Paper text:
With a typical circulating concentration of around 0.6 mM, HSA is the most abundant protein in blood plasma and serves as an important transporter molecule. Later crystallographic analysis of complexes of HSA with specific compounds confirmed that drug sites 1 and 2, as they came to be called, are located in sub-domains IIA and IIIA, respectively.
As was observed for dansylated amino acids bound to drug site 1, the dansyl group provides the most important anchoring interactions for binding DanF, DanNV and DanSRC in drug site 2. In each case the dansyl group occupies the same position in the binding site pinned between the side-chains of Asn-391 and Phe-403 on one side and Leu-453 on the other. The other oxygen atom of the SO2 makes a 3.0 Å hydrogen bond to the hydroxyl group of Ser-489 in the case of DanF; however, the distance between these groups is stretched to 3.7 Å for DanNV and to 4.1 Å for DanSRC. In the presence of DanF, DanNV or DanSRC, the side-chain of Arg-410 is rotated towards the solvent or becomes disordered. This rotation reveals a hydrophobic flanking wall of drug site 2 that has not previously been noted but which contacts the apolar side-chains of DanF and DanNV and the methyl group added to the sulphonamide in DanSRC. Instead of pinning the dansyl moiety in position — in the manner observed for DanN, DanE and DanR — the side-chains of Leu-238 and Ala-291 are found to hold the Phe side-chain of DanF. The dansyl group of DanF is re-located to the lower part of drug site 1, which was previously observed to be occupied by indomethacin; as with indomethacin, the binding of DanF induces a rotation of the side-chain of Trp-214 (∼140° about x2). Since DanF was found not to be displaced by binding of drugs specific to site 1, we conclude that the affinity of this compound for site 1 is much less than its affinity for drug site 2.
Numbering used by the authors: 5 to 78, 88 to 582
Write the structure that this text describes.
Amino acid sequence: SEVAHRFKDLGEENFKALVLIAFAQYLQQCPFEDHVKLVNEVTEFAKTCVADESAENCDKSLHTLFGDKLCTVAADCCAKQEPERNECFLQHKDDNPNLPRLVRPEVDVMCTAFHDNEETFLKKYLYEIARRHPYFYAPELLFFAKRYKAAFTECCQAADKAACLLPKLDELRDEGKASSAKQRLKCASLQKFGERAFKAWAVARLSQRFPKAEFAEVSKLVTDLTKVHTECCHGDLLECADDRADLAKYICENQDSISSKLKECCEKPLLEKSHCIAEVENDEMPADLPSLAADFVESKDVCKNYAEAKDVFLGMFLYEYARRHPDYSVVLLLRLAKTYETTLEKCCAAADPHECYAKVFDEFKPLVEEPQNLIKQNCELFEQLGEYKFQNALLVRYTKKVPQVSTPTLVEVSRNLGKVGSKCCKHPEAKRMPCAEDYLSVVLNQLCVLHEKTPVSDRVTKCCTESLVNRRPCFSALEVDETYVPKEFNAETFTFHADICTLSEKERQIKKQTALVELVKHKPKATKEQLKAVMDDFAAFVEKCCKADDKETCFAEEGKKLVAASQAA
């Protein structure tokens, strides 16, 4: 029995949470009560299996069971069987579910609901997250759950809870979203590019982190880590959580052989141990490391070793170049690795290989400089305009690049792209690249998955599927879509009402930002000069109407003077 197996390993508390998340991610539209019902029904069945490991259908696989329990409340997916059925659900996960924005009741209400029924209060948090983020890293979701519990348990018995809770919750909302984003990239990598692309990313990344660890060790870690994510991304949550635990035990046992900063980590609860390890800082670089040129360019055995085991050899190249370059981003190392392999494949087929592949490092120079100059420039620019105007500049830049993309998506992606400046520019040159480029990877992956749902721009598709590691350079290289045909104005689209006054300070910018996007789609060829001169106007239209006697009509009157002057520029 598989269910009995995983139940014992995870316990009832985790087993129940993990199954709840699985159901929330598969059927994101179904209400909370229903999932809760199926979880219990499933959980009890599991208890009978622990005893009689041959009772009802304790012999069946998790998917069969989970599948049959969801099919009692869903249709074409359920008409299929075993493999096809499961794949069906996976293909129907929705990265942008049409769910109602989540609003939080007054502190007083939450603390009452928390104190009264704690298990329920926590199970609904899990449910509301898992249904909105169908790819959230299950094991980590359990970690956020506990921290959420600690938030309430502590703040609800204080002087001013509003002051104690609200903050801790915002920090959690953001970090939860970041977390969801990073995991969305790993699944896309696996699902759209293959495990080989995933493995290479891990080798380079872990080699940067555990520079003292041996290649064979990293390889071992990478292999386990791959299976872990392969499972979480495919919906095998229980085994994912299980396997993740094992990997944490291993890493801790073999500390000495991996990294010296794993101490603090291995001295704490499971959930906190895993989370700790996954976010540990890079270890100190081994003192005397030979030159790479020795074994990879000067040696006359290159092509022979390459021929013998192309995978192991290139894998070793990555590990070696990565370990001594924690100042490079993972994508830059992968571009280098790809440039090195391309040189061997051609050179090793020449008369005198050595001569041909002797200047491969000269090929690396341009690739390393591109990222640096880009970052340098844009951080300087960021420092000058600040985060709000920088987001605006990005909205104009990206709407011009790919005008077809839906206004909600452009607004969302550009805002996030703007956050890269705040999160990264503050670091010194040494840590900027990893920061900047790996964050751009996550955000542009967001644009790619939201766009894959309803493809409208061939330019987006090409930049998203041609190469995982070159997405950033591809998007960067786009200027303006010259074939794009301007859109015709729509009254409703540019009609500002008084309801924009009740909206938070941020909810306003977002509106003014959404207007900017529509404007650029209308006048692609317009200039950053005109645009700014027009935006300022919109600002004026809000301040007056929002504060001018009983006027829900100023929205139409003053909005008229708005569109009028708007149609002019």
